[PDB]
Each structure stands twice: as C-alpha cells, then as structure tokens.
C-alpha cells in the first residue's frame, strides 16, 4: 500500500462569463437614415422590425435575469466584524478596502485593470447599448456579503439563519467532511495558515503577471465588437445595385424603374439584420448555459462543500471564494492535496483467537516488524485494539489474512 | 435615452418626429440618470425592491398617488457576532 | 479538415486512464497516484454504498465470476445488436445529408433559364445575363447561409453533449458518485472508459 | 420490512457523442465555378464569406 | 491543405492563381502531412508540448 505523510493547501482560479453587452437597433436610421421616401417604401414590407425588436428585448431582459440569478442569492447583507482576526488567516486580498473609493478588493481591482470615437459612429447608425440594470457597486456588495457569510458562518447561512462559529472549528469540520480527523488540523494550525497565505500571495502574483487568464471574457467582448463591425461593413455593400447612396440613385435614375435597386438594398439590409439577430440569439443561448453553470457552481462550491470530483477545482475541495470581474465571475477554490507518500505492507484482516478482525474505518499497515491501523488519507499509526476493529467470521474463508494479536483495553486493570 | 436633460427638444410648433405629445417641464419634475432623462416620475430618498426596472440601479413604481423612482435596495442589513470561542 | 488528435492518441489516453483507475483507484485524480490492491479498492467502494467489507471478503470469488460473466454478456450484446451505436451514426449521417443538400442546390435553376452559367453568358447579351447570374448567386448565397446556420446549431448541440460527457467522465470514472442514475442504473460502483468514432 | 439477501453485479453501456466532423467551404469556385467572368459580380456584394 | 507535395507549383513564370509568393522548394525542407504540404519548417525527431 501507499499512504501520504504530508499535505498541501492549494488555491486555483476559475473564470466563468455571466452576461454580455445588451444592444438595440433602429430600423429607420440603419436601413434608410434621413430619407422619408425610403421609410414610406419600407412601411409595406411587413413587421420584421417588430420581430427584431422583440428578440433584442428578450435578450436584454435575459442578460439581467442571468446576472440576478448568478449573484442575487442571499436575502441578507452581512457585515464583517471590525476586528479582522481569524486564527492566523489573513483574507486581506479578498476583503473590501474602504480606502479606495470603488470599494473593491485588491484582486477585484487587478481584475478590472486587466480587462479592457467608434461608439459615436455606431450610435449614429442606430446601434445603441443599454446600461446594465445592476451597477458594479452592488455586485461588489453582493460579493462582500457572500464572503462575510461564508467566513463568519460557513454553510449555515445557506440553509437558514446565520450561525456563528470559530474559523478553525469550521476548517476542522471541513477536514472531517473529507475523512480527515480534527487533530490533524489542531496540531498543524500554523503550518496550514502559512501555506494558505503563501498560496494566496502566489495567486495574487500570478494574476498580476500573466494577463492571458481572462482572455475568455475578453474573447466574448471581442466577438460582440466584431459583430457590430460586420453590420457596419454591410452598409458599404451594393448587393449588385448601382450605388449605396439613396440620393444618387433617386437623382440619376427615373423613379418608376429605380425602385428595383432600392428594393434590392432593403432586402439585403434586412437579411443582414436577420443574420446578426440569429447570431446574437445563438451567442445569448451559449451565455445563458454558461450563466446556469456559474450559478450552480456558486450554489454548490461556495455555499457548501461538494463531494463531486473536480467540480470545484483539482483535488479534494475544501472551500471557495467568489469575486466579480467585468461581465464575469472568478472562483478561488481552496483544496487539499496529499504529498510525501510512503510504502507499507498491508493485509485485508487480522487473525486472532481463531477469528477475523476488520478495521472500522482505517486500514492495516506494517512497517516490517509490527502491525498498526491508520486512516486512509494520512499516516497516523495506532495499536490495534478491539474498539477500532470488528469481528466477522473465522480464518478459513478470508484470503490473505495474517496472524497477529489484538490488545484488550479492559483486561489489564481488571486483575489490578 | 441618451439625453443630458438639457438638450430635450422643447419644439416650437412642429420640428420633431413626435406627433405633438411632448410634456415640457416643471410639471412632473426632471431626473437625470445614466440611462437617460426621466420625466413623469418623482425621485425619492427611500429604497425599496425593484418593481419596474429603469436601469443603472434605478427602478420605478406606482405608490397609493403617482409614479415615483428610486434606487433598488439589495436587502436588509444583517450582522453576525463573530467571536473567538462563541 | 482532419482532427488534431489522432486515434492512436485517444487510445493511449483511454489506456492510461484505465491503468490509473485499475492500479490506483481514485487517488490519481486528486493528486499523485498511490498503489492499492484491487480487492481493497473494491472493499472501499463497497463501504461507499454502505456495505461492510466482510460482504466482499467471503464473496470475492462469486463477485469476480459475476463480473466476468457480465462483461462477456456485454461483449456479446455489442457484437450481436447493431442498433446500439445509432446515437453516433445518425450524427455522421446528418453531416452527409447536409453535404448532399449543399451539392443538390447547385443543380437548381432558382428561377433562371438553366443551372449552368456559361451557357447563360454565351446565349445572349449581358443586360439580362447579369440578372440571371444575380438570381443564381442570391439563391446560392441563401443556401450557404442556411447551411452555416444549421451547422452552428448542430455544433452548439454537440458542445453541450461533449460538456455532459466530460462531466460524466470526471464524476463517474475518476471517483465514486452518489448521484442517482447519473453513472448507471442502480448503486454505482465504478466505470470504465472506451473510445469510439467521434 | 423487506431485507435483501443476495446481490448482482451489473454492467451497463452508455454512448455519448463528443466531436463533429470539421468542414471548410471554398466560396469562389462554389458560387461561380471556373468561370472568371462570374467572379466580378461578387465584389459589389462585399465580404459575404 | 489536402495537396500532395509532388504537385506543388514548380512553374516557369506563372502557373498558380495566388499572387506569386513562390519560395524555394527543395531547400526549404518541404514536408508531407496528412493535412497536406508544409513549406518553411524542418521536421524534427523529438517531441514537445
Ligand atoms: C510537510 O510540509 C511542510 C511544508 O509543506 C513542511 O514544513 C516545512 O519544513 C521545512 C523543513 O526545514 C521548513 O524549512 C519550512 O519552514 C516548513 N514550512 C514550510 C511552509 O515550508 C513539513 O516539515 C513537512 N513535514 C513532513 C513530515 O515532511
Ligand atoms: C495580509 O497580507 C498583506 C499583503 O497583501 C499584508 O500586508 C503587508 O504586510 C507587510 C508586513 O510584513 C508590510 O510590510 C506590507 O507593507 C503590507 N502590504 C500591504 C499592501 O498592506 C498583511 O500584513 C497580511 N496580514 C497580516 C495579519 O499579516
Ligand atoms: C516498526 O514500528 C515499531 C513501533 O513500535 C518499532 O518498534 C519500536 O522501535 C523503537 C525504535 O525506533 C524502539 O525504541 C521501541 O522499543 C520499539 N517498540 C516495540 C514495541 O517494538 C519497530 O522498530 C519498527 N520496525 C521497523 C523495521 O521500522
Ligand atoms: C496462524 O496461526 C494458526 C494457528 O497457530 C496457524 O494454523 C496452523 O497451521 C499449521 C500449518 O500451517 C497447521 O499444521 C496447524 O494445524 C494450524 N493450526 C490451527 C489451529 O489451525 C496458521 O498457519 C498461522 N498462519 C500462518 C500464515 O502461518
Ligand atoms: C449572542 O451574543 C451576541 C453578542 O454577545 C448577540 O449579538 C448582539 O445582540 C444584541 C441584541 O440585544 C445587539 O444589540 C448587539 O448589537 C449584538 N452584537 C453584535 C456584535 O451584533 C446575540 O444576540 C446573542 N444571541 C442571542 C440569540 O441572543
Ligand atoms: C481573542 O480575541 C482577541 C481580540 O478580539 C485577539 O487579540 C488580538 O486583538 C487585536 C485587536 O486589537 C487583533 O488585531 C489581533 O489580531 C488579535 N490577536 C493577536 C494575536 O494579537 C486574540 O488573538 C483572540 N484569541 C484567540 C485565541 O482567538
Ligand atoms: C446468490 O445468487 C447467486 C447467483 O445469482 C447464487 O449462486 C448460485 O448458486 C447455485 C447453487 O449453489 C449454483 O447452482 C449457481 O451456479 C450459482 N451461480 C453462479 C453464477 O455461480 C447464490 O447461491 C445466491 N446466494 C443465496 C444466499 O441465495
Ligand atoms: C514503493 O516501492 C516501489 C517498488 O519497490 C517504488 O517504485 C516506489 O517508488 C515506492 N514508493 C515509495 C513512496 O517509496
Ligand atoms: C450635462 O451637462 C452638464 C452641464 O454642462 C455637464 O457638466 C455634464 O458633463 C453633461 N453630461 C453629459 C453626459 O453630457
Ligand atoms: C503523393 O505522391 C507520392 C509520391 O509521388 C505518391 O506515392 C502518393 O501516392 C501520392 N498521393 C498521396 C495521397 O500520397
């Protein structure tokens, strides 16, 4: 058998987009502009613009719904105590700083800085951008409230009223959740705190150095930009007509036979708008799927402890921290990783007094001379007794059973 | 949308695409927000849950007398009595 | 365009995953791989579903025989029934179908005199051949746009399926899952991965 | 109450698609073939491909 | 893409619709992959990320 003898606290970063830019379009300016004749001709092509406006409004409300479901998950707004001491844990890099006017953590400020006349030109073509319903300040307040709740109460506030508990006790509970006894933490508190602080500093430095971690979010923004660019380029295409300017067509051609070019231009512009709307719908569906995944991760990893493998970061998940980023969320997963493994000799059961003994939760190991029982996730040998082992059957059906003795706690003092 | 509340077209007799339905000023007050210029509603210093989302943290609702606008409230403030051994 | 990852690389990944699961259990998915005898891993998994180790410790032979019989039955069922892999096959068929359509639209007049274009140019003067070519290119561009939209929708569906498959791989192969019916019907014990065309 | 007295080890199969065939389209010779004269009409339509 | 390295443009003056960016073939380590023909890269026997 192989059993680890040391542990390491690790911190990982995972970025998920939540919402995209809300956009609106105007038919009159983009398709016609300022010419009344074009609109008068457009009036009898149906209600395509109504469908486009309805779809855009649906996307706009869907973005706000996604943001609200992702972030607005707590009824109360918890406040951190003025005394910032948690038994050696720092949490300085994630707690809000009142000195800065933006009321954001250093990690949040770095995230904002790492993420980045054309606006007026796009507005002049009827393409406008609606501001988000929720401002960054309220998102920061939600993140701060979530952090305060998960620090001062653990997972108790995710199922009802918030219940206070010392942070070392909460981390002992978290270790007990993954099958590690509490005395492991209670004998290595300082080392665990130092490792956590070092990991937090390493994450801070890594996020400061390389800016390619958030490219995903940037990519999404880039996509939106290029989409708009394409639409602008669609205003420079004749689609096989004589010119892209209405006044020249109306002046250089006799109007009874000049209607064909105008109709061709209208059809081309409507087709381009429909293609853009379809692409926006597909992108919005993908963003909604990502937002649902992010909301599920927020509900599970942050508000509780998840036993799912690799769901909340590599290794044995311990806890998580949420942070906000421009059009996205960042999860800092704190997990547990074994290390410094050692070889040992193991047997399925112990034969004593013609009976087979099996461990309750531990595993039997041997160092070449003696036999002990130890927990499966950490090396802690103990003398085999009757309290941690149970008897089931005899020694003639079990394969690989070995011979040893089991100490009886009550027999020594019985005689004296 | 996109008006600084001062360039609002007051019109003379007919210079707008709007078919003469403009409310000028000082009747229902003027509010300036990031989304645009809002008229017909009176801003208040209180805070309630969002009913009609306007944008940029501004919402509107009809009380029982008129339509008013305010800033949405995130929730009720709460505090946890953290301690060394409690 | 040929795929970036060859079939040999996928087979090597599958073999590595199988060897890791066999010789280490779930310890290799959460850190360094630690060796463990297979009967002890089976006992741990039995403890996972609330069954004590003594049940396995005097039924190991019967359980091994049952597992061998079950895997043989699975092999025979895969060999006999050919309608089990349709979930993949139709997918490929769909692509071919789309391709066929994207070819067949080339033989449609789209309201013009003929599908062939050079005969249109040589038949008469440009003042009407231009209109015919305009109609043809508009129809072909509409067909291309429709094909692209269908491909995008199918790609989104395939991405959703791949995300589900990756989640199932992470939660069923690299460990024991307590979710009901997620990793099979009944009390889940452990899973084995295998590759297949797409 | 009903208490089980025996067990069965079962094996089930699950098939899941992963990847789709990657394709590329050449607009130039699909839209007009090898005829050079037809190619001149595309330029007035912009970057449609 | 999908072109055998044997029929790459050798040319006398012009035999290709591309705007004549022809480079030396033999001295540029022309290599053949299942994806087609690669010019300008020297294949090595090592392996990295
Ligand atoms: C388990 O690992 C920790 C750190 O991962 C070890 O603690 C370090 O021990 C070295 C030994 O001299 C010191 O220099 C360091 O200051 C200690 N702390 C850190 C954060 O590195 C610990 O000794 C290891 N224990 C075993 C049994 O291997
Ligand atoms: C938590 O971490 C911060 C680093 O972000 C520590 O702040 C630094 O502390 C050192 C003391 O060794 C000073 O020299 C630096 O100037 C501090 N930097 C900043 C930006 O404040 C902080 O001390 C840590 N918390 C505790 C309790 O030690
Ligand atoms: C296996 O572990 C046992 C633990 O008891 C070792 O036995 C002890 O060894 C120390 C020397 O390190 C002696 O001082 C004790 O008197 C021994 N106690 C008993 C009860 O034997 C044993 O030496 C270890 N064997 C190996 C090969 O490491
Ligand atoms: C553990 O102890 C038992 C009892 O001392 C051993 O069983 C004996 O085995 C020998 C030969 O292996 C027989 O001749 C005896 O009749 C057995 N005695 C009983 C009471 O069954 C057993 O072999 C020991 N285990 C090992 C691995 O040697
Ligand atoms: C447990 O003790 C804490 C602190 O001793 C109590 O929290 C205080 O409650 C009073 C209510 O009269 C408030 O005025 C204080 O502001 C609270 N303190 C803090 C730091 O918030 C708490 O009420 C006690 N629990 C119960 C059930 O009474
Ligand atoms: C018990 O609480 C006290 C204060 O609540 C802790 O003492 C220090 O208090 C100051 C506030 O003036 C903090 O800045 C320090 O971080 C606290 N700790 C230390 C070591 O100075 C005291 O540490 C707490 N004790 C325990 C065991 O939690
Ligand atoms: C539990 O079921 C297994 C098989 O499902 C039983 O094993 C069978 O036992 C009979 C009689 O001993 C044999 O004829 C069969 O060949 C066995 N099956 C196999 C696959 O070998 C077992 O007896 C059952 N146990 C109980 C307590 O009913
Ligand atoms: C255990 O032994 C094997 C072979 O004897 C060796 O390869 C392996 O590194 C050993 N493990 C440890 C932790 O020493
Ligand atoms: C609105 O006008 C005021 C007064 O000149 C000016 O300070 C402010 O910047 C203007 N805002 C915008 C958005 O134009
Ligand atoms: C490419 O050229 C080589 C050498 O002339 C020849 O053997 C091969 O059949 C050709 N075709 C392919 C697909 O490799």
PDB file of N, CA and C in Angstrom, chain A residues 74-79 81 85-86 130-135 138 141-142 151-153 162-168, chain B residues 1-2 34-35 50 53-59 71-86:
ATOM      1  N   UNK A  74     -28.575  35.749  -1.848  1.00  0.00           N
ATOM      2  CA  UNK A  74     -28.665  35.916  -0.404  1.00  0.00           C
ATOM      3  C   UNK A  74     -29.691  36.997  -0.096  1.00  0.00           C
ATOM      4  N   UNK A  75     -30.584  36.701   0.851  1.00  0.00           N
ATOM      5  CA  UNK A  75     -31.609  37.664   1.236  1.00  0.00           C
ATOM      6  C   UNK A  75     -31.031  38.795   2.078  1.00  0.00           C
ATOM      7  N   UNK A  76     -30.081  38.484   2.955  1.00  0.00           N
ATOM      8  CA  UNK A  76     -29.496  39.460   3.858  1.00  0.00           C
ATOM      9  C   UNK A  76     -28.207  40.024   3.266  1.00  0.00           C
ATOM     10  N   UNK A  77     -27.693  41.074   3.905  1.00  0.00           N
ATOM     11  CA  UNK A  77     -26.421  41.692   3.531  1.00  0.00           C
ATOM     12  C   UNK A  77     -25.560  41.688   4.791  1.00  0.00           C
ATOM     13  N   UNK A  78     -24.727  40.663   4.937  1.00  0.00           N
ATOM     14  CA  UNK A  78     -23.920  40.505   6.135  1.00  0.00           C
ATOM     15  C   UNK A  78     -22.751  41.486   6.136  1.00  0.00           C
ATOM     16  N   UNK A  79     -22.280  41.808   7.339  1.00  0.00           N
ATOM     17  CA  UNK A  79     -21.187  42.750   7.534  1.00  0.00           C
ATOM     18  C   UNK A  79     -20.086  42.084   8.343  1.00  0.00           C
ATOM     19  N   UNK A  81     -17.042  41.671  10.963  1.00  0.00           N
ATOM     20  CA  UNK A  81     -16.745  42.329  12.233  1.00  0.00           C
ATOM     21  C   UNK A  81     -15.570  43.274  12.087  1.00  0.00           C
ATOM     22  N   UNK A  85      -9.429  39.199  12.705  1.00  0.00           N
ATOM     23  CA  UNK A  85      -8.572  38.117  13.169  1.00  0.00           C
ATOM     24  C   UNK A  85      -9.328  36.804  13.054  1.00  0.00           C
ATOM     25  N   UNK A  86      -8.716  35.822  12.397  1.00  0.00           N
ATOM     26  CA  UNK A  86      -9.333  34.522  12.157  1.00  0.00           C
ATOM     27  C   UNK A  86      -8.338  33.401  12.426  1.00  0.00           C
ATOM     28  N   UNK A 130     -27.545  49.446 -24.116  1.00  0.00           N
ATOM     29  CA  UNK A 130     -28.299  49.729 -22.902  1.00  0.00           C
ATOM     30  C   UNK A 130     -27.444  49.449 -21.668  1.00  0.00           C
ATOM     31  N   UNK A 131     -27.443  50.362 -20.694  1.00  0.00           N
ATOM     32  CA  UNK A 131     -26.640  50.141 -19.494  1.00  0.00           C
ATOM     33  C   UNK A 131     -27.180  48.973 -18.690  1.00  0.00           C
ATOM     34  N   UNK A 132     -26.318  48.250 -17.979  1.00  0.00           N
ATOM     35  CA  UNK A 132     -26.794  47.129 -17.163  1.00  0.00           C
ATOM     36  C   UNK A 132     -27.671  47.604 -16.017  1.00  0.00           C
ATOM     37  N   UNK A 133     -28.627  46.752 -15.640  1.00  0.00           N
ATOM     38  CA  UNK A 133     -29.522  47.086 -14.537  1.00  0.00           C
ATOM     39  C   UNK A 133     -28.767  47.185 -13.218  1.00  0.00           C
ATOM     40  N   UNK A 134     -27.831  46.273 -12.975  1.00  0.00           N
ATOM     41  CA  UNK A 134     -27.063  46.246 -11.738  1.00  0.00           C
ATOM     42  C   UNK A 134     -25.705  46.898 -11.959  1.00  0.00           C
ATOM     43  N   UNK A 135     -25.385  47.885 -11.129  1.00  0.00           N
ATOM     44  CA  UNK A 135     -24.093  48.545 -11.199  1.00  0.00           C
ATOM     45  C   UNK A 135     -23.024  47.698 -10.515  1.00  0.00           C
ATOM     46  N   UNK A 138     -23.103  47.394  -6.507  1.00  0.00           N
ATOM     47  CA  UNK A 138     -23.992  46.420  -5.884  1.00  0.00           C
ATOM     48  C   UNK A 138     -23.477  44.998  -6.065  1.00  0.00           C
ATOM     49  N   UNK A 141     -20.953  44.643  -3.457  1.00  0.00           N
ATOM     50  CA  UNK A 141     -21.610  44.464  -2.165  1.00  0.00           C
ATOM     51  C   UNK A 141     -22.134  43.042  -2.002  1.00  0.00           C
ATOM     52  N   UNK A 142     -22.689  42.465  -3.070  1.00  0.00           N
ATOM     53  CA  UNK A 142     -23.118  41.069  -3.026  1.00  0.00           C
ATOM     54  C   UNK A 142     -21.944  40.141  -2.746  1.00  0.00           C
ATOM     55  N   UNK A 151     -17.489  33.326   5.759  1.00  0.00           N
ATOM     56  CA  UNK A 151     -16.397  33.376   6.725  1.00  0.00           C
ATOM     57  C   UNK A 151     -16.929  33.275   8.149  1.00  0.00           C
ATOM     58  N   UNK A 152     -17.929  34.088   8.487  1.00  0.00           N
ATOM     59  CA  UNK A 152     -18.435  34.156   9.851  1.00  0.00           C
ATOM     60  C   UNK A 152     -19.437  33.059  10.185  1.00  0.00           C
ATOM     61  N   UNK A 153     -19.970  32.351   9.189  1.00  0.00           N
ATOM     62  CA  UNK A 153     -20.985  31.341   9.460  1.00  0.00           C
ATOM     63  C   UNK A 153     -20.783  30.022   8.729  1.00  0.00           C
ATOM     64  N   UNK A 162     -28.120  32.587   9.940  1.00  0.00           N
ATOM     65  CA  UNK A 162     -26.671  32.508  10.059  1.00  0.00           C
ATOM     66  C   UNK A 162     -26.277  32.146  11.485  1.00  0.00           C
ATOM     67  N   UNK A 163     -25.363  31.189  11.619  1.00  0.00           N
ATOM     68  CA  UNK A 163     -24.885  30.724  12.915  1.00  0.00           C
ATOM     69  C   UNK A 163     -23.383  30.947  12.992  1.00  0.00           C
ATOM     70  N   UNK A 164     -22.943  31.677  14.013  1.00  0.00           N
ATOM     71  CA  UNK A 164     -21.527  31.968  14.165  1.00  0.00           C
ATOM     72  C   UNK A 164     -20.768  30.736  14.649  1.00  0.00           C
ATOM     73  N   UNK A 165     -19.499  30.664  14.259  1.00  0.00           N
ATOM     74  CA  UNK A 165     -18.625  29.548  14.614  1.00  0.00           C
ATOM     75  C   UNK A 165     -17.180  29.983  14.398  1.00  0.00           C
ATOM     76  N   UNK A 166     -16.256  29.631  15.293  1.00  0.00           N
ATOM     77  CA  UNK A 166     -14.848  29.979  15.069  1.00  0.00           C
ATOM     78  C   UNK A 166     -14.324  29.375  13.774  1.00  0.00           C
ATOM     79  N   UNK A 167     -13.491  30.147  13.075  1.00  0.00           N
ATOM     80  CA  UNK A 167     -12.964  29.700  11.788  1.00  0.00           C
ATOM     81  C   UNK A 167     -12.133  28.425  11.884  1.00  0.00           C
ATOM     82  N   UNK A 168     -11.220  28.259  12.851  1.00  0.00           N
ATOM     83  CA  UNK A 168     -10.537  26.961  12.968  1.00  0.00           C
ATOM     84  C   UNK A 168     -11.495  25.800  13.157  1.00  0.00           C
TER      85      UNK A 168
ATOM     86  N   UNK B   1     -33.703  58.198 -23.976  1.00  0.00           N
ATOM     87  CA  UNK B   1     -32.392  57.571 -23.867  1.00  0.00           C
ATOM     88  C   UNK B   1     -31.306  58.493 -24.408  1.00  0.00           C
ATOM     89  N   UNK B   2     -30.182  58.553 -23.701  1.00  0.00           N
ATOM     90  CA  UNK B   2     -29.033  59.320 -24.150  1.00  0.00           C
ATOM     91  C   UNK B   2     -29.240  60.817 -24.221  1.00  0.00           C
ATOM     92  N   UNK B  34     -27.941  57.691 -15.708  1.00  0.00           N
ATOM     93  CA  UNK B  34     -27.012  57.206 -16.721  1.00  0.00           C
ATOM     94  C   UNK B  34     -27.744  56.700 -17.957  1.00  0.00           C
ATOM     95  N   UNK B  35     -28.917  56.089 -17.774  1.00  0.00           N
ATOM     96  CA  UNK B  35     -29.701  55.615 -18.908  1.00  0.00           C
ATOM     97  C   UNK B  35     -30.208  56.757 -19.778  1.00  0.00           C
ATOM     98  N   UNK B  50     -36.983  46.422  -6.486  1.00  0.00           N
ATOM     99  CA  UNK B  50     -37.266  46.859  -7.845  1.00  0.00           C
ATOM    100  C   UNK B  50     -38.611  46.324  -8.319  1.00  0.00           C
ATOM    101  N   UNK B  53     -37.954  47.944 -13.712  1.00  0.00           N
ATOM    102  CA  UNK B  53     -36.533  48.270 -13.868  1.00  0.00           C
ATOM    103  C   UNK B  53     -36.311  49.337 -14.929  1.00  0.00           C
ATOM    104  N   UNK B  54     -35.715  50.447 -14.507  1.00  0.00           N
ATOM    105  CA  UNK B  54     -35.334  51.534 -15.400  1.00  0.00           C
ATOM    106  C   UNK B  54     -33.907  51.357 -15.899  1.00  0.00           C
ATOM    107  N   UNK B  55     -32.980  51.096 -14.999  1.00  0.00           N
ATOM    108  CA  UNK B  55     -31.602  50.838 -15.370  1.00  0.00           C
ATOM    109  C   UNK B  55     -30.631  51.619 -14.506  1.00  0.00           C
ATOM    110  N   UNK B  56     -29.372  51.171 -14.518  1.00  0.00           N
ATOM    111  CA  UNK B  56     -28.295  51.783 -13.738  1.00  0.00           C
ATOM    112  C   UNK B  56     -28.653  51.853 -12.256  1.00  0.00           C
ATOM    113  N   UNK B  57     -29.319  50.812 -11.763  1.00  0.00           N
ATOM    114  CA  UNK B  57     -29.730  50.780 -10.375  1.00  0.00           C
ATOM    115  C   UNK B  57     -30.942  51.616 -10.048  1.00  0.00           C
ATOM    116  N   UNK B  58     -31.623  52.151 -11.053  1.00  0.00           N
ATOM    117  CA  UNK B  58     -32.808  52.974 -10.857  1.00  0.00           C
ATOM    118  C   UNK B  58     -34.030  52.158 -11.242  1.00  0.00           C
ATOM    119  N   UNK B  59     -35.039  52.162 -10.373  1.00  0.00           N
ATOM    120  CA  UNK B  59     -36.307  51.495 -10.622  1.00  0.00           C
ATOM    121  C   UNK B  59     -37.442  52.476 -10.366  1.00  0.00           C
ATOM    122  N   UNK B  71     -33.815  54.079  -6.001  1.00  0.00           N
ATOM    123  CA  UNK B  71     -32.728  53.130  -6.188  1.00  0.00           C
ATOM    124  C   UNK B  71     -33.080  51.826  -5.485  1.00  0.00           C
ATOM    125  N   UNK B  72     -32.937  50.713  -6.200  1.00  0.00           N
ATOM    126  CA  UNK B  72     -33.317  49.417  -5.662  1.00  0.00           C
ATOM    127  C   UNK B  72     -32.485  49.069  -4.433  1.00  0.00           C
ATOM    128  N   UNK B  73     -33.134  48.435  -3.462  1.00  0.00           N
ATOM    129  CA  UNK B  73     -32.491  48.014  -2.227  1.00  0.00           C
ATOM    130  C   UNK B  73     -32.052  46.561  -2.356  1.00  0.00           C
ATOM    131  N   UNK B  74     -30.776  46.304  -2.063  1.00  0.00           N
ATOM    132  CA  UNK B  74     -30.244  44.952  -2.184  1.00  0.00           C
ATOM    133  C   UNK B  74     -30.833  44.002  -1.152  1.00  0.00           C
ATOM    134  N   UNK B  75     -31.168  44.492   0.027  1.00  0.00           N
ATOM    135  CA  UNK B  75     -31.745  43.654   1.059  1.00  0.00           C
ATOM    136  C   UNK B  75     -31.557  44.287   2.423  1.00  0.00           C
ATOM    137  N   UNK B  76     -32.020  43.561   3.437  1.00  0.00           N
ATOM    138  CA  UNK B  76     -31.929  44.034   4.811  1.00  0.00           C
ATOM    139  C   UNK B  76     -30.536  43.768   5.366  1.00  0.00           C
ATOM    140  N   UNK B  77     -29.923  44.803   5.933  1.00  0.00           N
ATOM    141  CA  UNK B  77     -28.591  44.663   6.504  1.00  0.00           C
ATOM    142  C   UNK B  77     -28.629  43.762   7.732  1.00  0.00           C
ATOM    143  N   UNK B  78     -27.621  42.902   7.853  1.00  0.00           N
ATOM    144  CA  UNK B  78     -27.526  41.982   8.974  1.00  0.00           C
ATOM    145  C   UNK B  78     -26.078  41.909   9.430  1.00  0.00           C
ATOM    146  N   UNK B  79     -25.889  41.556  10.699  1.00  0.00           N
ATOM    147  CA  UNK B  79     -24.564  41.438  11.289  1.00  0.00           C
ATOM    148  C   UNK B  79     -24.464  40.133  12.063  1.00  0.00           C
ATOM    149  N   UNK B  80     -23.287  39.517  12.018  1.00  0.00           N
ATOM    150  CA  UNK B  80     -23.016  38.266  12.713  1.00  0.00           C
ATOM    151  C   UNK B  80     -22.003  38.534  13.816  1.00  0.00           C
ATOM    152  N   UNK B  81     -22.328  38.092  15.031  1.00  0.00           N
ATOM    153  CA  UNK B  81     -21.486  38.338  16.201  1.00  0.00           C
ATOM    154  C   UNK B  81     -20.377  37.291  16.243  1.00  0.00           C
ATOM    155  N   UNK B  82     -19.377  37.492  15.390  1.00  0.00           N
ATOM    156  CA  UNK B  82     -18.207  36.627  15.396  1.00  0.00           C
ATOM    157  C   UNK B  82     -17.394  36.848  16.666  1.00  0.00           C
ATOM    158  N   UNK B  83     -16.812  35.765  17.175  1.00  0.00           N
ATOM    159  CA  UNK B  83     -16.057  35.823  18.418  1.00  0.00           C
ATOM    160  C   UNK B  83     -14.995  34.733  18.410  1.00  0.00           C
ATOM    161  N   UNK B  84     -14.097  34.807  19.396  1.00  0.00           N
ATOM    162  CA  UNK B  84     -13.015  33.833  19.489  1.00  0.00           C
ATOM    163  C   UNK B  84     -13.548  32.423  19.711  1.00  0.00           C
ATOM    164  N   UNK B  85     -14.481  32.259  20.655  1.00  0.00           N
ATOM    165  CA  UNK B  85     -14.920  30.929  21.061  1.00  0.00           C
ATOM    166  C   UNK B  85     -16.425  30.869  21.306  1.00  0.00           C
ATOM    167  N   UNK B  86     -17.208  31.646  20.564  1.00  0.00           N
ATOM    168  CA  UNK B  86     -18.657  31.648  20.694  1.00  0.00           C
ATOM    169  C   UNK B  86     -19.284  30.947  19.497  1.00  0.00           C
TER     170      UNK B  86
END
